[PDB]
Amino acid sequence: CPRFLKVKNWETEVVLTDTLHLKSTLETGCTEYICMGSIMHPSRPEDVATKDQLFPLAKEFIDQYYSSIKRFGSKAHMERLEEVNKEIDTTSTYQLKDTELIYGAKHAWRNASRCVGRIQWSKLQVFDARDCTTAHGMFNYICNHVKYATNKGNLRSAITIFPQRTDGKHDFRVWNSQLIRYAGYKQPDGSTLGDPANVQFTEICIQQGWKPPRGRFDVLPLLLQANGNDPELFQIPPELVLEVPIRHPKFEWFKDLGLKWYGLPAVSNMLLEIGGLEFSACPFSGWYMGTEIGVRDYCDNSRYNILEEVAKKMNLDMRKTSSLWKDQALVEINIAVLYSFQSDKVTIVDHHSATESFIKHMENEYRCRGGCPADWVWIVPPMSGSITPVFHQEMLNYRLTPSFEYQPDPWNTHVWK
Amino acid sequence: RFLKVKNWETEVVLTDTLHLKSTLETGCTEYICMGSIMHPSVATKDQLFPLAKEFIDQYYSSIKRFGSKAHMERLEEVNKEIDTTSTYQLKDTELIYGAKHAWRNASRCVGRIQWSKLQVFDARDCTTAHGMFNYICNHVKYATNKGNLRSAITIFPQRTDGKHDFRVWNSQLIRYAGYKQPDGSTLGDPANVQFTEICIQQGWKPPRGRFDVLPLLLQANGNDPELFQIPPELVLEVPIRHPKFEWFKDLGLKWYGLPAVSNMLLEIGGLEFSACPFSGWYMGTEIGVRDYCDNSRYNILEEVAKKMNLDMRKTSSLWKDQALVEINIAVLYSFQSDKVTIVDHHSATESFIKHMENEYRCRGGCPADWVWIVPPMSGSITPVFHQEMLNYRLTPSFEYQPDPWNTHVWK
Ligand code: HEM
Ligand code: HEM
Ligand SMILES: CN(C)CCc1cc(F)c(F)c(CCc2cccc(N)n2)c1
Ligand SMILES: CN(C)CCc1cc(F)c(F)c(CCc2cccc(N)n2)c1
Ligand SMILES: C[C@H](O)[C@H](O)[C@H]1CNc2nc(N)[nH]c(=O)c2N1
Ligand SMILES: C[C@H](O)[C@H](O)[C@H]1CNc2nc(N)[nH]c(=O)c2N1
Ligand SMILES: [Zn+2]
């Protein structure tokens, strides 16, 4: 690899110089002859790291941590190295200190190349839930997380971290992909009620005993697995689920569509890797960018898919695509979503503000850290791409650790007791 | 190994085998992806014959005569020619096959469903800038066709020693001038200020308006470039108006009908065609999103949103997004009303998905650059947004080359 790589912004002419890529640790999926940059998941859950694999991964993280606190090579550094090395020898694993857990979680977010919101990465509240033993305890921790992060609409980013993987047969998992999502119900006639993306998970919940109200916006129950046991269902207390009815500043009829959305985006299916340790249950939450709701959730064809109905109430020419009736309604839907969150004082960021902040963050990271891995395909918003600054920004993508990773869906790997 | 690409809206999976045939690099490694970099960083006899043989082989494979007497004889003919001249000349049929396949292989082009319908004009007998001018005028007239646009390419002599290059100095055959103003601002197209200044330096008398068609600056056989005015009756233009906003016409906006790239290099079988202007028809967003609304181009969003009386005090009103959609409605409406070929990004991306299905079936894959294929507005309501794509480099191909004013030794 070359020692310096340059990225250019084609709107501003600013050129940045990347040296951080030299620390990349895992594969991207690309090769010298093919680029897999638009593949969503480019390449068993119970083959766990051996002692020999774990030693160097732990040292690399411990070294990175002591370098970050300006104590590299110190007595405390060498003693921590020695202590970790003994633990891996006698127990095949080790335990992070609280300071290291917090450092690791913040840097997994800092390293998340697909996240446009990383200007906030150092302001993450970390809840240590490694003492948890049961699904009931996981439920308690998650409710506390939801309440803290929601903060009556003044949302605060947060992560709750459950015990790390041991042999792979005692994993903690949140089976929900997000803490708060709406059910989807397949009808005998082939139509779908609610959110079609959640039809499979809704069916699992019903089979586990959930009684479905069968409405358009039913919050799904939590399905929580502690210590590899069978998962257990819990209803989130509805007062903890902040929701926003969607209305439009100009169209009085928009409220008559009956749309609403929840305030808290909380991803619960990712795996947190710190120092070769694997935290398979690590729900984290921020605040929404408006397009995640307005463009994807509402206007994806396989989601709520409301463009047609809004276009009809806007009385648009829907016969030919070149009228841009879809584009026109899409803007109005996203105007309504931003207006509704701001009116109810629920934190939200529009795609112009978020991408402008990301460019400033990226520039600061290039100066102070030597780079900032970024996935252009994910960072550019799903509407109005070129009128945001990130469209014109060349980006380098590479995988640093600590990191968030995908993992298999737990219903596909779980051994039912 | 076979690679799978999935559409996450339709769940269709396609299996790519065609990437196995590529040998040129992408810029990525196993550790760093460079998929959003715009440009990731003369041939001898020794390099030339394997490249020629590879191209002759795929040509005769394409016409189902691989290993034939014709194939074997062509290989021998090419081998002798590289020996005695350090180069070789393509047959007419090879030139046409190579230009069409350079288009077919252009991973950044959403228009490739049309690839085999390309009119190829052989200009390899040209020797002077006056001849280049003639050939380019014939191309423009043919491609424009009174608004019923036809895809075409004109191919000038190949590179020899690098000292006698043919070059069109214009980046596109038809473009508008840009002028740096005393008070600092820019009149016309800001993207062309430098090229405009070179034409002025070479004697072009600028009208100093907002939509002045630039002259052609033509370099033949490595000589100094010469200026030519494209005859105005050949330059088809569209005044932009809006189907509902009657004030839109008062903005005084226009564009030209013919998108004609003239600064790329065409590589076929090891040969380099440094002058190869090619042209198609516009996708609406090329004009309405990039040319008009890029902050570094005509940059008209503020003006339009003003006439729409939008609240511009805060980004979250999405006033930019509202004005952008109206501008792109106007462009499509205007070309359609004047019966000038244009495609909207919904129709174009749908066609590209169908093209991909075609290529995976008959060819085993289709190289495609998601970063460029997804339109600059309304991305996820077009089907390509949800389509995984593999990007890899096949030859024949179009390549970028340095601007001639950074290389030319002026005589
Ligand atoms: C604080 C405000 C935040 C904003 C505005 C934000 C914004 C976004 C957006 C728009 C995406 C793309 C989502 C999609 O299209 O599915 C994303 C992805 C991501 N975010 Fe952030 N995020 C925030 C907080 C966080 C936090 C607190 C974490 C972790 C501690 C995080 C980690 C990630 C990761 C790992 C991804 C990639 C997800 C994937 O590949 O599925 N983000 N973010
Ligand atoms: C016939 C209608 C065509 C349409 C609608 C179309 C559409 C497009 C668009 C929208 C782009 C992106 C360019 C940009 O954003 O600046 C592009 C790229 C490209 N087009 Fe096509 N195109 C067409 C015909 C052609 C033809 C005839 C050729 C050559 C024979 C061609 C070769 C290319 C190449 C090489 C690129 C990539 C340029 C680069 O790498 O920068 N296209 N096309
Ligand atoms: C398929 N994809 C459109 C949906 C995936 C998806 C569904 C959700 F419910 C959801 F909250 C997130 C959130 C991603 C995220 C995390 C943190 C902050 C933020 N702003 N965003 C992502
Ligand atoms: C980033 N930018 C400086 C490059 C601009 C650029 C460079 C190229 F080589 C190129 F082929 C095209 C294609 C534009 C085009 C061609 C034909 C039809 C059409 N509708 N459009 C555009
Ligand atoms: C095929 C493509 O990779 C896929 O549709 C991606 C594109 N970019 C994205 N970008 C974001 N932020 N979120 C997504 O889900 C996707 N989906
Ligand atoms: C940095 C980035 O690669 C650059 O802005 C690209 C993004 N995608 C694009 N896509 C198209 N079709 N045309 C472009 O000029 C660009 N510019
Ligand atoms: Zn890549």
Do A301 and A362 reside in the same domain of the chain?
A: no
Query: What is the CATH classification number for the domain harbouring A293?
Result: 3.90.1230.10
Q: What angle do CA B60, B65, B66 make, to 5 degrees?
A: 65
Structure tokens at A396: 């380098």
C-alpha closest to that of B259 among B309, B185, B157, B331: B331
Residue B38's H or E segment, with its range, is: none
**CA of B140 vs chain A CAs: smallest distance (Å):** 26
CATH number at residue B368: 3.90.340.10
CB A211 within 8 A of CB A202: no
> Angle at CA B233, nearest 5°, toward B231 and B239?
120
Is residue B169 a part of any domain in this protein?
yes
Question: Dihedral of the CA atoms B75, B77, B80, B83 (nearest 10)?
Answer: -70
CA B270, distance to chain mean position in Å, is: 21
Hey, are the CB atoms on B328 and A328 less than 8 Å from each other? no
**In what helix (H) or strand (E) does residue B189 lie, and over which residues does it extend?**
none
A35 reaches B (C-beta below 8 A): yes
**Same domain assignment for residues A238 and A190:** yes
Q: Are residues B156 and B34 in the same domain?
A: yes
Q: Is B46 on the interface with A (CB under 8 A)?
A: no
Question: Does any domain span residue A7?
Answer: no
**Alpha carbon distances (Å) from A144 to A149, A159, A219:** 9, 11, 17
Tokens 């508008």 sit at which residue? B176
Residues with CB under 6 A from ligand 1: A 109, 112, 114-117, 120, 124, 157, 159, 284, 286-287, 289, 292, 349, 354, 378, 404
**What is the CA angle B303-A388-B107, rounded to 5?**
115
Q: Do B293 and A331 touch (CB under 8 A)?
A: no
The one catalytic residue in B74, B103, B104, B112 is B112
Whether A8 is covered by a domain: the verdict is no
**Solving technique for this entry?**
X-ray
Query: Under DSSP, is residue B403 helix (H, G, I), strand (E, B) or coil?
Result: coil
How big, in percent rounded to 5, are the helix, strand and coil portions of chain B?
40, 15, 45
Q: Are A387 and B293 an interchain contact pair (Cβ–Cβ within 8 Å)?
A: yes
Task: Please state, in angstroms and rounded to a whole number, the distance separating the CA atoms of residues A340 and A337.
Answer: 5
| d(C-alpha A270, C-alpha A284), whole Å | 9
Distances in Å between the alpha carbon of B203 and those of A26, B263, B360?
A: 57, 22, 52
Phi-psi region of A144 (alpha: psi -120 to 50; beta: other; left: phi over 0): alpha
Pocket of ligand 4 (CB under 6 A): B 111, 259, 261, 264, 280-283, 286
Exposure class string for B102-118: b at 16+ Cβ within 10 A, else e: bbbbbbebbbbbebeeb
Q: Which of A290, A326, A391 is facing B376, going by the closest CB pair?
A: A391
Please tell me whether residues A104 and A207 are part of one structural domain: no
Residues in chain A: 417
CA-based nearest distance A181→chain B, Å: 19
Pocket (CB within 6 angstroms of ligand 5): A 38, 40, 377-378; B 8, 385-388
- Could you identify the residue written with the tokens 């298999």? A408
Instruction: Say if strands B237-239 and A403-405 run parallel, antiparallel, or are unpaired.
Output: unpaired
Element (H, E) at A260: strand A260-262
A325: CA distance to ligand 5 center in Å? 23
Please report the resolution in angstroms. 1.8
Residues of chain A neighbouring B32 (CB-CB closer than 8 A): 1, 5, 21, 24, 28, 30, 396-398
Are residues B383 and A300 in contact, defined by beta-carbon separation less than 8 angstroms?
A: no
Q: Is B2 near chain A, with CB under 8 Å?
A: no
Residue B255 shares a structural domain with residue B292: yes
In terms of domains, do B82 and B120 share one?
yes
Instruction: Please state, in angstroms and rounded to a whole number, the distance separating the CA atoms of residues B137 and A319.
Output: 39
| B281 SS3 class | coil
Instruction: Give the span between the Cα atoms of A165 and A163, in whole angstroms.
Output: 7
Ligand 6 within 6 A of A392 CB? yes
Under DSSP, is residue A175 helix (H, G, I), strand (E, B) or coil? coil
Tell me the CATH number at B220: 3.90.440.10
Nearest to B314 by CA among A246, A329, A350: A350
Report which ligand 4 atom has the smallest distance to the Cα of B38: 1
3-state secondary structure at position B203: coil
Domain membership flag for residue B196: yes
Does residue B270 share a domain with residue B157? yes
Whether the CB of A352 is below 8 Å from some CB of chain B: the reply is yes
Those of residues 250-309 in A touching chain B at CB distance below 8 A are 290, 295-296, 299-302, 307
Ramachandran assignment for A345, one of left (phi > 0), alpha (psi -120 to 50 degrees), beta (any other) = left
Q: Which residues pair with B279 in a beta bridge?
A: B152, B260
d(CA A380, CA A383): 8
Spatial CB neighbours of A154, under 8 Å, sequence gap ≥ 6: A345, A347
B198 within 8 A of B227, measured Cβ to Cβ: no
- Torsion (CA) A297, A151, B316, A16 in degrees, nearest 10: -90
At A248, list the tokens: 């439009």
Q: Which residues of A touch B3 (CB under 8 A)?
A: 34
B245 among annotated binding-site residues: no
Facing residue for A338 by CB, picked from B316, B332, B379: B316
What is chain A's alpha carbon radius of gyration, rounded to the nearest angstrom? 23
CA-A9 nearest atom, ligand 6: 1
Answer left, alpha or beta for residue B254, where phi above 0 means left and psi between -120 and 50 means alpha. beta
Q: Are B255 and B272 found together in one domain? A: no
Domain that holds residue B302: 237-259+282-347
Specify if B391 maps to a domain. no
Residue B379 falls inside a structural domain: no
Residue whose structure tokens are 């299905």: B357
CB B196 within 8 A of CB B309: no
Residue A233 located in a structural domain: yes
What is the B232 CA–ligand 3 centroid distance (Å)? 54
Q: Which residues of A touch B9 (CB under 8 A)?
A: 300-302
CA A56 to the chain's CA centroid = 28
Which has the closest alpha carbon to B186: B41, B294, B30, B48? B294
Per the listing, tokens 């960072």 go with A379
Provide the phi-psi class of A370: left if phi over 0, else alpha when psi is between -120 and 50, else beta.
Answer: left
Residue A94 shares a structural domain with residue A142: no
* Radius of gyration for the alpha carbons in chain B, expressed in angstroms and rounded: 23
Round to whole Å and give the CA distance between A304 and A258: 12
Please indicate whether, in this complex, the C-beta atoms of A34 and B317 are within 8 angstroms of each other.
Answer: no
Query: What DSSP string runs through A273-341?
Result: EETTEEES---EE--EEHHIIIIIIHHSTTTT--HHHHHHHTT---S-GGG-HHHHHHHHHHHHHHHHH
Kindly write down the DSSP assignment for every residue of B332-395, as one continuous string.
HHHHHHTT--EE-HHHHHHHHHHHHHHHHHHHS-----HHHHS-SSSGGGSGGGGB---B---S
What is the secondary structure of A28-85 as a DSSP string?
Answer: -S--SS-B-TT-SS---TT-PPPHHHHHHHHHHHHHHHHHHTT-TTSHHHHHHHHHHH
Partners of A194 in the β-ladder? A184
Residue found by looking up tokens 């940045």 in the block: A16
Residue type at position B206? P
The encoded tokens of residue B123 equal 């200009």
**Pocket flag, ligand 3, residue A292 (CB < 6 Å):** yes
Contact predicate A176/A268, CB 8 Å: yes
Task: Provide, as residue numbers in chain B, all residues whose Cβ is less than 8 Å from the Cβ of A375.
Answer: 33
- Could you tell me if A138 and A129 are in contact, meaning their C-beta atoms sit under 8 angstroms apart? yes
Q: Where do the H-state alpha helices sit in B230-343?
A: 284-285, 292-293, 301-307, 319-337
Give the ligand 5 atom nearest the CA of A377: 8
B36 lines ligand 6 (CB under 6 A): yes
The helix/strand/coil state of B10 is coil
Residues of A in contact with B374 (CB under 8 A): 385
CA A106 vs CA A97, A132, A161, A402, B398: distances in Å: 14, 21, 12, 9, 44
What is the rounded end-to-end Cα distance, in angstroms, of chain B?
54
Maximum distance among all alpha carbons in chain A?
74
Q: Which two tokens stand for residue A146?
A: 């939801």
CB atoms within 10 A of CB B79: 13
Whether residues B213 and B338 share a domain: the answer is no
Cα(A324) to centroid of ligand 1, in Å?
A: 30
A14 near B CB under 8 A: no
Question: By C-alpha distance, which of B220, B273, B261 is closest to B99?
Answer: B273
Q: Does residue A132 sit at the B interface (CB-CB below 8 Å)?
A: no
Residues of A with active-site annotation: 115, 118, 287, 292
- Cβ atoms < 10 Å from Cβ of B269: 23
B107: in domain: yes
C-alpha B182/C-alpha A228 separation (Å) is: 73
> Does B410 lie at the interface with A, CB-CB under 8 angstroms?
no
- Cβ–ligand 3 distance for A265 under 6 Å, the answer yes
For ligand 1, atom 39, which residue shows the shortest CA distance?
A114
**Same structural domain for residues A69 and A140?**
no
Contact A11, A392 (CB under 8 A): yes
CB-based contact B158:B87 (threshold 8 Å): yes
For chain A, helix, strand, coil in percent to 5 are 40, 15, 45
Phi, psi angle pair for B282, to nearest 5°? -75, 145
Q: What distance in Å separates the CA atoms of residue A286 and residue A289, rounded to the nearest whole number?
A: 10
- The residue of chain A nearest to residue B37, with distances taken between CA atoms, is A394
Please state the domain count of chain A: 3
Token digits of residue A73: 């090579």
Residue B284 backbone class (left: φ over 0; alpha: ψ -120 to 50; beta: rest): alpha
What pairs with residue A15 in β-bridges?
A8
Q: Is B119 annotated as a binding residue?
A: no
A100 and A74 both lie in a single domain:
yes
In the DSSP assignment, the letter for residue B171 is: S
Of residues B37, B315, B316, nearest to A394 (C-beta) = B37
